[PDB]
Amino acid sequence: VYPKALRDEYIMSKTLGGEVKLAFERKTCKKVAIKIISKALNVETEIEILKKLNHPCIIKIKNFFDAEDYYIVLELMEGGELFDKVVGNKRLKEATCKLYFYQMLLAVQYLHENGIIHRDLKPENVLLSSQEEDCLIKITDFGHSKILGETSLMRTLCGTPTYLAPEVLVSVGTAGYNRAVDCWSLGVILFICLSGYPPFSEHRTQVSLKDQITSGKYNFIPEVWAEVSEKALDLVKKLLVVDPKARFTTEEALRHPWLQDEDMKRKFQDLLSEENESTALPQVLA
Amino acid sequence: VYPKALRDEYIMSKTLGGEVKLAFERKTCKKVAIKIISKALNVETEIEILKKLNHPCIIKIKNFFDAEDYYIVLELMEGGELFDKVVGNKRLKEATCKLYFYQMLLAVQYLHENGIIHRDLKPENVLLSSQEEDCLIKITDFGHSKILGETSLMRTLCGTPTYLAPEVLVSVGTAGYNRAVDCWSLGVILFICLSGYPPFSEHRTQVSLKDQITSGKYNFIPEVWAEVSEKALDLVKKLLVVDPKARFTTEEALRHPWLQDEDMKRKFQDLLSEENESTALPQVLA
């Protein structure tokens, strides 16, 4: 059963999906999601990174339980996963893509600004605020996240490479572009939402999946993409770049013409206030 | 001053060189070396890896103190560093090279067998048993050592790389050859001992050091190397290989003709017994 400590604070209820169950906080009679990561190392880090992070498009941890299985109290996303909105070739409206992707770009930028590589961005980790088409999106599943700190390469470089291996000196070139893996993931999420299908698939194709990804030669159905804008596909193209040093950054994509949309940005700020206003404390007037 | 706890067990004396001082264990009136790593993370790992390791060519930790500065009680190597035997173009006899290198190859093999990449092998980390030419050698300075475990790449590979970045799939090729950095270091140690000079130096040369190492084009003075054997240089050549996948392994070098020397191997076993016999307990006879 559920630990005594979890039970004192919350009323565990129906499963929402490492399993996720809906629960109610006793103090507040408020709906919460409780993630069960069964028993282990990355859960300690996950909690640690989450406690530190603070952005509207990144999920917030409310409480945490160490027991036979780990329990993570998270704010409830009533729109569910982004995946449920893209399955079976379900294509989102272009503005609905713009609004979500923008938020993803902001979230990921913050992560990168704060030296955090998510490493596992997928529609199955993007959560929607409401059951509304226009809503706030939150990045979840920080299990695979990496922290940046002082590299063992940086420390090595301070010395004279008399005995140093060549491959290490070689590594110095490509070094410090790990984060660009999130930009590719973003590129794959954005390709999916627009088209309805994945860029690199094993469906009706003779070429290997590894080959597709390494070649950067995505499956392009123009009949499907005729529906999508010129600006939207140019961004996908700019992100789905093989050379990580040449790929777009979160900043570069944010700058891109596709995202320079005032009606979209307005909708987002208007969504932010709507959430924020409830928790708002009176401010000191001039 | 020295902590109260260190003082209770040992009598701290004269400096031997992160500083190293000679000390005397009170219980035993025995000479010991006490390494002072001033205050920090890698010291915890260093101790941890050392406690676990157990080989005649790897240094043994005797005790350890957590204070304002870290204190590591190590077995005293009365011949000092290997560096003191190679400075100012001091060249060791070929058999003296064979005997030491063999021991280095064994030590490093054990490290690799046990999933430990030393990462910082240099003459300044190779310690000699006695002030004798023929003696036992011990690998020290485990500060930069890496542990092998389950890679985050191995875990990634279990899934479908739908959203996975190309550079990661690319990395799978070169993956799991980090240890070959120790074989290069070994190659550079062996080149030094034989010749008296370093293979990749900035002395009287127009080419960059990084370039020398990346090109794998070592400084070759035949007048100096005429003195050395054909078998000895072939091993250096086999180790100083640019492609880490093509480089010699500790096993491969151990197999090499240069090391297939019975008089050398005999001398080593004879040195082992000499050390071991003092600590020897009577064995149960057949």
Ligand SMILES: COc1ccc(CNC(=O)c2ccc3nccnc3c2)cc1
């Ligand atoms: C009224 O109760 C509900 C209404 C809508 C939903 C849809 N949401 C979900 O399915 C869901 C699943 C996992 C989650 N993990 C973390 C945060 N929020 C989550 C939300 C779930 C319950």
Ligand SMILES: COc1ccc(CNC(=O)c2ccc3nccnc3c2)cc1
């Ligand atoms: C009688 O007293 C001595 C005789 C010879 C020496 C030469 N040895 C050393 O110089 C020395 C230095 C650092 C070390 N670090 C770890 C283990 N052993 C070490 C030995 C040092 C003292």
